[PDB]
Structure formats: structure tokens, C-alpha cells
Amino acid sequence: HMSSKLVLVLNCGSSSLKFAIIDAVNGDEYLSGLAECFHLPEARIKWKMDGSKQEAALGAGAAHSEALNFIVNTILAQKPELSAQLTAIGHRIVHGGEKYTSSVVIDESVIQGIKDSASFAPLHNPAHLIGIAEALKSFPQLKDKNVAVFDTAFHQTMPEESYLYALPYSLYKEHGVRRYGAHGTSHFYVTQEAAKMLNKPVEELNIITCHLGNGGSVSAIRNGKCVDTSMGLTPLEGLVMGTRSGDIDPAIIFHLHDTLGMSVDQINKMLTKESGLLGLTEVTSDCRYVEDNYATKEDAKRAMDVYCHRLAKYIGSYTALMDGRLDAVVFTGGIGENAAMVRELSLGKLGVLGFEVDHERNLAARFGKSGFINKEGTRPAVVIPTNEELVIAQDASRLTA
Amino acid sequence: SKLVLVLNCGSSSLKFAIIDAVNGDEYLSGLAECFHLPEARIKWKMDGSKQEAALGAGAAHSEALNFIVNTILAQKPELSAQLTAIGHRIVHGGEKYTSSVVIDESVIQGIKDSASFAPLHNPAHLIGIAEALKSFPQLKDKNVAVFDTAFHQTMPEESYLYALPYSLYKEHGVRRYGAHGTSHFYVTQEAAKMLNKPVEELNIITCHLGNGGSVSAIRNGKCVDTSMGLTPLEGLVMGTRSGDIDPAIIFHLHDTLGMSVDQINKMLTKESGLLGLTEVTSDCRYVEDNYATKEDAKRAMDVYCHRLAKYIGSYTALMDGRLDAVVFTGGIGENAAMVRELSLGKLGVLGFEVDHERNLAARFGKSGFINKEGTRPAVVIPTNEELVIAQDASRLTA
């Protein structure tokens, strides 16, 4: 009566490949790893399987081909019973444009769809296609069982009110300039879980979801559907992030260019690689540093306060999307699951809404534990660990198997 | 009777008024636009009925203020001796100026230094000051500068810093400064009067909607956050200004659509906002009148109200547990009933419920509470920035 449906989850960048084998039915992880430092002498691949840690090098100047070669011919070859059990392959895509509102099975037209959306993700989307092309060559058996899962799909339920910028409308009509967001897969996941935790249908769910980790985004959920999100055309907009600025006076770009002599490419690299938490603390991108030192160091305090200021205002701003009812706020992601004070300090600014954190409960909801962190009688607040890998596995399985 | 000459100088236009700083009585109005052009003309309304004349062809501030002395104040010489001070509107006071000040050489120097932030407006204000001191010799020690950025200087670093490299603030003063400060200040003081409580205990969110749009968060009578930033571009949807955008849109337009920095800069400030949304006009009156019958107006109304409603919502994070009222002011804010209603209608979670009958009454220079009786207060207060200039000018020279 019981069954397993193992799916290979792949997350391909231009110099990285995050891979995992998940049983879509129950969520069991059979393998996970990371092949990094592509086209360099350092080129290595790390993995936890049974699960203990193994590290090997693929060779100086290694590409995605040998990255899947090592998985097939070295890792999967030892456990052939595991290899045969594979029923599908899921691919994460950063940007799916307006064409893709949900996960889809990969064919020639999807390859083109990803290629056409590449305009919005010029660095990430091309790398997905390389990984997609290698998965078809390394796994011939699963060539009609490849599925694409879009970071943006979940945000396509947004009404025009939310996706349109106050720019020339022609810019949308003929160039697709629109709010698309990201972390859609995570935003979806925590919504489904919040239903379990609030003991109510996902269809009746009015929550504000905060994915804070590798990038940061807040989303406004109305009746289970996303009606607004913090990231925009690109992942640059919204929250204070590890290395990204988020919201700025757009005119700053012009002030950096015309007054400070910085090139478009210089400014682009600053807002993307040199801003955010690295910008505020002239030290590091790591939120763990700020979480620990904000009580003792000035640079850490200024970073924390700006961060939490930004987060609190976004939660507060999405009351405009709630149509009179807010069931709970949700925290998730590397930071959202682990950083207690970030949750305490940012929600503490929202007393008007009815938010106040319990310290004892807040600390308890860390390092994988899920829980309600709100003080009793106050508006619900949940820590729910995310699982983007699982969503890709579930979707890849449902549409293929 | 404390009479003040209020001056608002720009690149090609000098806007002027004589206001009584005791009771707000206007004794004169004016506008000397089209400088350095054949269209050089004046439009001076007065206690005695209005008229329009022509300054000349290729005119400057020196001629404008002299025309006020030799012609405008020639017919009415009773109020010339009545002048006690002069008030200058300054766009950017930088970090230096937290309140209005008496103009000496260090203030001139201060406005020069700030001119990095308002390169078009601040040098022009200086020419205005220059001519005001020579055209009105009697009042050379009685010129007062009122700054659009002054009121927001009570902002903590939590609000005024962008998540950029900290050196950009340290070395270059890159910071949130805002605007409409003289308006946000005024309506704050008035809200206290209407809410029958002290300004020092006043927690409100203020919305100046008109020539540009700005929302401010006030805690205990002090501004703690504002929607506009380094420049007036950031924040709300405005006439031609985009407000908040994904910063990357600029890089996309530049790198993908081949647009120049100048071309994107023009678009964002002159081709966007309501003009961008409705491919028709920047005029908000179009949006107010047609949002129920025309698609383009509806599109623009919804997006406008969405941005405003979110901003008001976002500033609950600054209220520290208590929000007394939301305030609407400015050309748009005082008169656009449905703009007020549609945006506050999105904030039901917060307890906002617009009373339509009250909403319609509070229009055209009329103040009033537009909220339903048991619900969270929402007030319309007509701003008076010229009076605040007159008051500051008069109070600091008595």
C-alpha cells in the first residue's frame, strides 16, 4: 500500500551545482551535495549520503558534465539500487516570466520559455539550461521526466495592482517589466504548513510570509494565494539582505553615477556584492555576526536596527493586502529559522498590529524546531523551517509519475 | 500685524507672497516665471483684485524682485513699511539644519554645500537670497531660510540609512533626507489641535499628496521616518515620478534595452507615475473622475492607492504601539476624496473605515475627520506652507 517516488533535485549555477535525492512521498533524503569552483584548479564535489561527509575533486577545470559524471559514475554506481529507484528529475529555475504560473514538464517549448525569460535572469537561467542539457545526457531514461520548478511561479497569482510599477505602461506591455519576486517555492511551502499549524484550510489563509536567508523576501498571502511580494523584477528589491541593498532611492544610482563618477557596472556590483549587511557592518555578510554582537558592537547594532526596521515595515505594509484579516506572520529561511532576536526586535516594532514576541518561546523555535513565538493573547507568529528541495521533488513526481 | 515676504525661487520661476504671520492673511501673491525667455511674465494677485503683466524677454530674478519694489509695491505703499522679515524656501538643508535659521554667510555657505543634493534648486535659491538682500536693504538682517528637509532631521540612523556601504554616508552624506517638511510639520501641529492632545504625545502618519507625494511617520511630535529619500524620487506614485521601483529596473533598461542613464533618469522623473500608468496625463483629477469608467484611470488609481495604503501600513513599525490618526494634505490629499477612501479601505486590519459623507464634506480647503464614529481617526487638514515660512521668519526676528 505504501510507496516511494525518488526524485533527483538539481539546482544549477554557472560555477555551482546543488544536488539532492528526495523521496517525494514522505520527504526522505537519500543523498545531498554540492559541486563547486567550476573552471578552476580547486574544482571539488562534497556530499552526505548514508549519511556521512565525503569530499573529492573532479579535476582542474571541471564543468557540469563531470559534475553529473561523478554523481552517476562514482556516487550512484556504488549504490545501483538507489540509481534504478529514480522516477524523475526536478530543476529549479530562478525566473519563469509570466508564461509559467506553475511547475511544468520540460520539453522544447520550456527550454525556449526559460531562454526567453533569461532576459530577467541573465546569469542564472543560462546555467539552468546547461544543467538541464546534462541531465538529459547523463540520465537518458528520464529524458521525458524532467520538470522545471520556478522561483517566480507562486507569485503569478498577484493582481495588476501589485505587479505594476508606476512606470510607462508600454514597458510592461512590450518588455514584461513587472514584479516577479523570488523564493516562491519556499513561500508556497510555509503557506501549506501554516494551514496545518493554524488548523484551517489553505484556501482561507491570510498570512504574511518572511523568507530570510540566502536573499530575503516577504510575501502577502490572501486566501492561500500570493497577492504581493517584496522582490521585484529581480531579487534586488525589498528587504535588507546579506550582500544586497534592497530598497533604495532610485535616484541614488544617478547620484553615484553623476556626482560620484561610478559606472553602471560599478554601481551594479555595489548594490549586489557590496551592500546590505556587508554594507552596514563594514565587516561581513553573515547574519550570525550581527545576531550575536549587536549588544556589544556599534557596527553590528546599526546593521541589526536597519535590518529589523526594513522587515517590520514590510510586514506592516502588507496589512494593505489583508482585506481586514491577518491570521499570523510566518518566519522561515536560514535567518528566519535561527535568528531569534531578528524575530523579536522586528515584531516588537509592530505593537499597533498586535505583535509581541515571547522570549522563552522564540529561543525554543530554533535550529529546526517549528513553533509559535507570539506572547499569549497577541497575534500569532510562527517559525516554520522551509524545504524548497521537497517542493521540487513533489512537483516533479506529481507531473511525471 | 506681522507681515512677511515669502519667496520661493527656482531655475526659471520666482513664486512670491506677503503673508501676515499672526493670522495667515494673504496681502499679495505672485509668480514671475519664464526667466531667460520671451515668455517672461508675471501673475500677481492681491487684496485689491488680480492681474497679469509681462516682465520682458530674457528676464532674471534681479528684475522680478525689483518689479515688486518699483511697480507692485508702488501702487500699495502702505504694506511696504509693514514688512518685518523675508522667508526663503530651501529644498535641501543637508544634515546641518534641523530647524529654520536666520540667513548669514554661513547659511549661504551651508546651502552651497548642500547643493550637491539639490543641484538644480539650491544654487537658484542663492540668487534669490542675493537679490532679496539688495532689493530690500532694510531687511538684510531679517532673511530666514526654511528647509524642506529640516523637519525629517529628527530621524534615527535606523530610518535614515540605506543598506549601502557605510562609507557612502560617512564620506558623501548619502542618506534619507525627504521633503514636504514644512507641510508635514504644519499638519502635525494642526492634528494635535483637532485631536485635543499635545503635539509632544502625538503619534500620527501624515500624507502630503500634491506636487510630489510624501508620507511621514511621526512619534511624539517628531518625524521618525519619511517616504522620500536622498531626493524626492523615492516613495509614492506621483504625477510623473515613478516612486519606488526595483533598483535593478535601471540596470535592465540600460543593459537590455540600451537606454542611457540620462534617458532612464528622464523617464523615471518625467514619464512615469500617473503619466506612466495612464498613458494620458499626470493630472490626478483625471484619475479621480474616471477610475470607474476608464481602464487607464482604474489602473493608475489602484496602483496609486496600493502604494499609499502600503506606506501608511508600513509606518505602524514606527508608532511603538500607538497610532492616533492618519492625516491627508496637499493639492491631491485635500481634494481627492476617493483616493483617500480607496487606500484607507485597504487597511481594514488596522481598523480604518472611511465615512463617505464625512469624506465628501472634507474637500476644497475644508478640514475634517473622514473616519466613521467608532473607528481609528483619519483627518484631512489643508496645509499652509507659506504661513509656516512667515511664522518662522517672524518668530526668529522679533
Numbering used by the authors:
A (entry chain A): 0 to 400
B (entry chain B): 3 to 400
Text from the published report:
In the present study, we report the biochemical characterization and structures of S. typhimurium AckA (StAckA, NCBI accession: NP_461279.1, residues: 400, molecular mass: 43.3 kDa) in two crystal forms at 2.70 Å (apo, Form-I) and 1.90 Å (citrate-bound, Form-II) resolutions. StAckA protomer consists of two domains with characteristic βββαβαβα topology of ASKHA superfamily of proteins. A cleft between the two domains forms the active site pocket of StAckA.
The subunits of a dimer are related by nearly perfect non-crystallographic two-fold symmetries. A total of approximately 81 residues (20% of total surface residues), of which 23% are polar, 53% are non-polar and 24% are charged, contribute to the interactions at the interface leading to approximately 23 hydrogen bonds and 8 salt bridges. This analysis indicates a stable dimeric interface. The analysis revealed conformations of StAckA that were similar to both the open (Cα rmsd: 1.15 Å) and closed (Cα rmsd: 1.23 Å) states of MtAckA subunits, and in conjunction with fluorescence studies, suggests that StAckA is also compatible with the inter-domain movements as observed in MtAckA. It is possible that the structure of Form-I StAckA protomer represents an intermediate state in which the active site is accessible to the solvent and ligands. Intriguingly, examination of Form-I StAckA as well as other structurally known members of acetokinase family revealed a similar cavity at the dimeric interface.
